[PDB]
Amino acid sequence: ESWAQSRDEQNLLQQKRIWESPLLLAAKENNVQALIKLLKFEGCEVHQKGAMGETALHIAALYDNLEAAMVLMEAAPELVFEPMTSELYEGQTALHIAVINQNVNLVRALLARGASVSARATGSVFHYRPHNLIYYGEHPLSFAACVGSEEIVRLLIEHGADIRAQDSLGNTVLHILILQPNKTFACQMYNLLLSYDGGDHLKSLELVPNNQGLTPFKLAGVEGNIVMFQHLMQKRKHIQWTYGPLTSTLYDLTEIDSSGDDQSLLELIVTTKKREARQILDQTPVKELVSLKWKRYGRPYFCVLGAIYVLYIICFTMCCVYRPLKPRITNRTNPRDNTLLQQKLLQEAYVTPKDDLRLVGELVSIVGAVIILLVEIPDIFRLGVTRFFGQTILGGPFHVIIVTYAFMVLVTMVMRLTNSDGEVVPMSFALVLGWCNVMYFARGFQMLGPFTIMIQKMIFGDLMRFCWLMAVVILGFASAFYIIFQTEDPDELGHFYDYPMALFSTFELFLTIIDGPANYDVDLPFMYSITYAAFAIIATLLMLNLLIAMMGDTHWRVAHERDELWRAQVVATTVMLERKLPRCLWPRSGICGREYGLGDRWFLRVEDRQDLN
Amino acid sequence: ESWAQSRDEQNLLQQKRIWESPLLLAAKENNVQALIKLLKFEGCEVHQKGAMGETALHIAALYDNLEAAMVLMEAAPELVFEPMTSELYEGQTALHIAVINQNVNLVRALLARGASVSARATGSVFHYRPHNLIYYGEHPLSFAACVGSEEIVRLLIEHGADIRAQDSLGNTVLHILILQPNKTFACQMYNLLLSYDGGDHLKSLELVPNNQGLTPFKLAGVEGNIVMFQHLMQKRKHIQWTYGPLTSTLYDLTEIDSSGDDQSLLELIVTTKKREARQILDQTPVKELVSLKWKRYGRPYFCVLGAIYVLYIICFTMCCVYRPLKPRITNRTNPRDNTLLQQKLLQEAYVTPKDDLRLVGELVSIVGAVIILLVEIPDIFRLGVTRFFGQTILGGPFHVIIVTYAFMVLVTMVMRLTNSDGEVVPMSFALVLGWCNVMYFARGFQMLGPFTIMIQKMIFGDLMRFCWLMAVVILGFASAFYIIFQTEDPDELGHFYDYPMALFSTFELFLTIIDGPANYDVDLPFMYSITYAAFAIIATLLMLNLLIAMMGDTHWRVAHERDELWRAQVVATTVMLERKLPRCLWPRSGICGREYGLGDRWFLRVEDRQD
Ligand SMILES: [Ca+2]
Ligand SMILES: [Ca+2]
């Protein structure tokens, strides 16, 4: 990009000023003997700049020079307050740089001389963007508490570093630590922050969400943080009793699901994209709910919703094959090739009640296409069109077939009551979608779930890299088969009588479903045989018989993700019905309070086996 | 099922009535100071109940609070004789808790005051059910003898704990040690139980069957336990001699062999469904019977009975193709689709003695149909209605084919001397099932054997998850194709002239056997060439060529669970034959007894090499 080259030009111009401006060079080389000479009788210069507008203190801070910064604090005791000011770096101060480079004795010096511990690091490089490497928030407490320098963490809080602090993204200091991938310390560094949460108001520092409304318990599951999730879980897990090897424990379940307002954690999991945000389902309180919500309640309602669906498509199919048809309205087979002896009725014949019994049947299937549009036009009303044509399998392309099937039946309603000739065209797409859409209910089955994802994976993923190989090879030999048979009879051996037939014939000799154009009464032209024998090798025993190995390579190599997706297919099916079915038949999952002195949070009982003495 | 929920509902109620009645509350947190204050002057309360009617002494022990338990015995010396009075906890007295929770000093003191160390505990959580976690039996001696605490085992017997004591499941202590999963101590504790057995006037301890008639050597074999089955063997394995590295060794074979009285270990293994039960059949006093019982006597008797089966079908197959047929009795010429010009005879045509030669062919093939219904009735009458329709592959679905074969042959017998027209249809199943039922004799072959398991394993498990993914698609495009060609002639391009043919002709295009319809003289409707192309992409290179990789993935994943089943398939043939044939051509396995100075137990000799 043109933007990333701008970072290169400045950072080389940043170094050019260091080869100029001799005190900055004296600052980089830890040169103190020149720096006394360049200041203590003439000086004249002390508020220097660079390419990023930094000072000699910042230069003496980026390279670890306690001696050089010692003279600079003594020379001008107002260097410590002003920040960097540029496009990329903005608002960063010498307190920040001294933190990230772990320089404990320098931070001890700067706080004694007076440094702003609330300096906003509002620069351009600091934003949480994937083309930046590290994201440490803004405040100098966050820069310490992320790299794990817990001594400086203790050093800052003694000088009035506020824990409550939000960035431009609304994140607090606990939202940050969940985001570093090299975790390793952030179990321990988490607790040191709560050890300074001793005296506050009623919001106990974890009930403070981000800008998009997401507490650090919620943020741990959304970001795929297995290590920090169990560390948070130990806080809200209550152990009831132990009895030899049986330990029964309670779980909080106040935000695990508690699917009662808008932002249940089970809803947040099956919307995301991250591969590791989906294995929270492995963990011990969530793998109980989505089992019990599905097995006692979710499974039988889903089949009743499925078994009512098959009887709908049949009622549409049973009124499809009973179209009104006339025998051969007006014409008589004029050139050739008019194998067409029928005509549909005008809509002036609904007499003879087994043509009227269908009329109450289509009215069933014409209101069935209204209710599907009424349940999916309010789906783009809440979340955008990138949900449909995004390839999120958790409710995948089964939301673009059912709309088109709903959209096609109304076109038949438009093709009816206008008396237009061509109207097999919506009804042909109406059946090939309306039957292939009962594939959606192959989802909650034990044996037929994870097969369906493999069909969905080879349609796009491993046939959009074969059809571009199919359409090229066909376009050669189909055009080549035209030229050979151009000066020939289409009567005897007539597989190619024009070019739009000549693809359709050649397309099926590639798939080996038609036989292969051969006649023996007549003498085929000699270039037909050489051309077709090269077609038969490359297609039949080099392309199709490559593709069977192409599947089998990619079949055993991803059969540990389809067992992860299929479980998440069930969960997104479960929560979809919880926010849709009215609460007369799904009770709230778990055990409530206030019959027991509990605290009104809905709880859930878990008992396991300790297997040690 | 709200019952396990109802377990969870009551567990909070104990934890609510403990916050009331504060001596129960102090009993949890062993507050010895306040417990003095609630007792020494007024008290008035000590016979408390909980949600399950439990005591303060229970809660003082359910949490290991020994100091508070000291005061309760001194204040109330009557609590130790009364049980928990509920459904979920019935009969569990205060001793049961302190045993499982390993409390040495409390059991030393509770028996010092003296508790019933033989009282029974029969709550709903304690019965041997798959939903409860641990099963430690009923009696308090069993609870010590399942956790590994050898001292409490030594302590209870000194105070009068009867070892020989059965539960409602009839299990002893020695049956229950077999059932814990992580053994790790139980084999080491197994010696401690038989140390206290004396061998009295009564029968010795391991000769006690359970409530379902089963000894603790059999129950190590049914449950798939290996490590107990090793340790049980050394008490009955006699060393003959050694010769350098060689050891010739004489095994007991008292109960391992069939020997009549059908509760035998080689019987009880291949009837059960536990997967690790068939892992026993590699242990050395078992794998050598089933070699010698099969190699010298199970191999030829099975194949000779195999050859009389092939001669049975051919004597029906030649009998089938020689029916009597008249040319076209009285009808003529439905002017289309009436290719029907032969008609079977009424049974008034038994002239021409190549019908008399056929008459013995029917009667040979009609008696074998009866003898199957005399050999296979004594299995569903011997409780096999859940075994045939059960998918126990050890004798799999070949037992439901052969009854269906014998049923259709007798339907044919009804068809003759009734002169009903449809005899082709029941005779048509009598060939595709009769010939495919010779596949059962491909069991005892070195080579052909474990392939037949994969055929049985693909029909149920990797094809029935594909036939549902066909009848969806193949019902889509058949009703699609029929509407396209509805305004078209059936005379030319008549692949779909009515709708039941339109499914059947679609079913073959999905398998690539018909060529796909085409007729280059007549102009196809333009919606045909769009649809059929997209049906030939789904079928040929996306569904069929995916079904092949479904096969090839799971083949090398059960390529070592068919070499487990086939070895267990052979043994289930030998044991089935051994009780069926009279023991006059079968010798009994092993060497005899009292002809040598032995003691009548049928022994067996196996010699090995050490290293
Ligand atoms: Ca052909
Ligand atoms: Ca063919």
What is the CA(B32)–ligand 2 centre distance, in A? Answer: 92
**DSSP class per residue in A286-342:** HHHHHHHIIIIIIHHHHHHHHHHHHHHHHHHHHTTTT--EEE--S----SS-----E
B545 touches chain A (CB under 8 A): yes
A508 touches chain B (CB under 8 A): yes
How close is the nearest chain A Cα to the Cα of B130, in Å? 14
Nearest residue in B to A497, CA atom? B520
CB atoms within 10 A of CB B27: 27
Residues in B closer than 8 angstroms to A424, CB to CB, are 483-484, 487, 525, 527
A472 touches chain B (CB under 8 A): no
B4 touches chain A (CB under 8 A): no
Q: Do B546 and A455 touch (CB under 8 A)?
A: yes
CA dist list (Å): B38 to A11, A345, B42, B54, B63 = 79, 96, 7, 19, 20
Residues in B closer than 8 angstroms to A340, CB to CB, are 487-489, 525
Residue of A316, A421, A431 for testing the chain B interface, max B β-carbons within 10 Å: A431
A339 touches chain B (CB under 8 A): yes
How close is the nearest chain A Cα to the Cα of B448, in Å? 26
Tokens of A48: 């220097």
B462 touches chain A (CB under 8 A): no
Report the side by side order of strands in the sheet with B246-251: B238-243, B246-251, B604-609
3-class secondary structure per residue, B312-334: HHHHHHHHHCCCCEECCCCCCCC
d(CA B392, CA B273): 7
A306 touches chain B (CB under 8 A): no
In the annotated binding site of B for Ca(2+), the residues are: 515
Three-state SS at A372? helix
**B477 CB contacts (<8 Å, ≥6 apart)?**
A432, B506, B531, B535
Q: Do B9 and A556 touch (CB under 8 A)?
A: no
Residue of A317, A423, A435, A609 for testing the chain B interface, max B β-carbons within 10 Å: A435
Nearest in space to B111 (alpha carbons), one of B120, B102, B99: B99
CB atoms within 10 A of CB B344: 17
Q: Do A339 and B516 touch (CB under 8 A)?
A: no
Q: CB–CB of A141/A156 below 8 Å?
A: yes
Tokens of A174: 């606990």
Q: Do A547 and B545 touch (CB under 8 A)?
A: yes
CB atoms within 10 A of CB A473: 16
What is the CA(A499)–ligand 1 centre distance, in A? Answer: 23
d(CA A227, CA A188): 12
CA dist list (Å): B125 to B117, B162, B230, B300 = 20, 24, 32, 53
Q: CB–CB of B75/B40 below 8 Å?
A: no
Q: What experiment produced this structure?
A: cryo-EM
Tell me which H or E stretch contains A355. none
Q: Is A515 exposed, middle or buried (0-12, 13-18, 19+ CB in 10 A)?
A: exposed
User: Closest to B527 (Cβ–Cβ): which among A241, A424, A551?
Assistant: A424
What is the CA(B476)–ligand 2 centre distance, in A? Answer: 23
- Reading phi first (left if > 0) and then psi (alpha if -120 to 50, else beta), residue B55 is in beta
Q: Do A428 and B488 touch (CB under 8 A)?
A: no
d(CA A172, CA A588): 32
How many CA atoms lie within 13 Å of A606's alpha carbon, on the beta-carbon side? 21
d(CA B175, CA B183): 13
CB atoms within 10 A of CB B409: 24
How many CA atoms lie within 13 Å of A445's alpha carbon, on the beta-carbon side? 19
Phi, psi values for residue B607, rounded to 5°? -115, 145
**Single-letter residue type at A176:** I
How many CA atoms lie within 13 Å of A12's alpha carbon, on the beta-carbon side? 4
Q: CB–CB of B535/B557 below 8 Å?
A: no
Q: Calculate the dihedral angle through the C-alpha atoms of B21, B27, B30, B31, rounding to the nearest 10 degrees.
A: 20
A315 touches chain B (CB under 8 A): no
B493 touches chain A (CB under 8 A): yes
**Which letter does DSSP use for residue B243 in this model?**
E
Nearest in space to A434 (alpha carbons), one of A401, A481, A477, A476: A401
Angle between helices A526-539 and A499-510 (to 10 degrees): 50
How close is the nearest chain B Cα to the Cα of A504, in Å? 7
Q: Do A611 and B182 touch (CB under 8 A)?
A: yes
CA dist list (Å): B403 to B282, B302, B398, B399, B437 = 34, 20, 9, 7, 11
A611 labeled part of a ligand binding site: no
Tokens of B567: 């070895």
d(CA B145, CA B149): 7
Q: Do A451 and B465 touch (CB under 8 A)?
A: yes
**B551 CB contacts (<8 Å, ≥6 apart)?**
B458, B462
What is the CA(A462)–ligand 1 centre distance, in A? Answer: 29
Spell out the domain ranges in chain B: 1-283+589-611, 284-588
d(CA A225, CA B401): 55
B182 touches chain A (CB under 8 A): yes
What is the CA(B516)–ligand 1 centre distance, in A? Answer: 9
A243 touches chain B (CB under 8 A): yes
Q: How many Å is the maximal CA-CA distance in chain A?
A: 116
**Which letter does DSSP use for residue A567 in this model?**
H
B423 touches chain A (CB under 8 A): no
Nearest in space to B369 (alpha carbons), one of B424, B408, B398: B408
Tokens of B332: 């003529």
Q: Do A442 and B468 touch (CB under 8 A)?
A: yes
Nearest in space to B416 (alpha carbons), one of B370, B351, B362: B362
Which is it for strands B325-326 and B246-251: parallel, antiparallel or unpaired? unpaired
Three-state SS at A237? strand
Q: Calculate the dihedral angle through the C-alpha atoms of A605, A611, A612, B5, rounding to the nearest 10 degrees.
A: 20
Nearest residue in A to B185, CA atom? A613
**A46 CB contacts (<8 Å, ≥6 apart)?**
A39, A56, A75, A76, A79
Residues in A closer than 8 angstroms to B523, CB to CB, are 336-339
d(CA A235, CA A233): 5
Which is it for strands B604-609 and B246-251: parallel, antiparallel or unpaired? antiparallel
Residues in B closer than 8 angstroms to A442, CB to CB, are 468-469, 472
Residues in A closer than 8 angstroms to B464, CB to CB, are 447
Q: Do B472 and A436 touch (CB under 8 A)?
A: yes
A613 touches chain B (CB under 8 A): yes
User: Closest to B515 (Cβ–Cβ): which among A341, A513, A551?
Assistant: A513
Q: CB–CB of A48/A56 below 8 Å?
A: yes
Residues in B closer than 8 angstroms to A544, CB to CB, are 541, 545
Tokens of A478: 């189909």
User: Closest to A458 (Cβ–Cβ): which among B100, B527, B542?
Assistant: B542
**DSSP class per residue in A37-101:** HTTSS-----S---SS---HHHHHHHTT-HHHHHHHHHH-TTTTT---BSSSSBS--HHHHHHHT
Q: Do B553 and A548 touch (CB under 8 A)?
A: no
User: Closest to B483 (Cβ–Cβ): which among A424, A459, A513?
Assistant: A424
| Residue linked to tokens 């594939």 | A439
Alpha helices by DSSP H, listed for A86-183, are 94-100, 104-113, 140-147, 150-157, 173-177
Radius of gyration of chain A (CA): 36
| Separation of CA B510 from chain center | 37
Residues in B closer than 8 angstroms to A343, CB to CB, are 487
Q: Do A514 and B512 touch (CB under 8 A)?
A: no
Phi, psi values for residue A438, rounded to 5°? -80, -5
Nearest in space to A56 (alpha carbons), one of A33, A91, A30: A30
**Which letter does DSSP use for residue A196 in this model?**
T
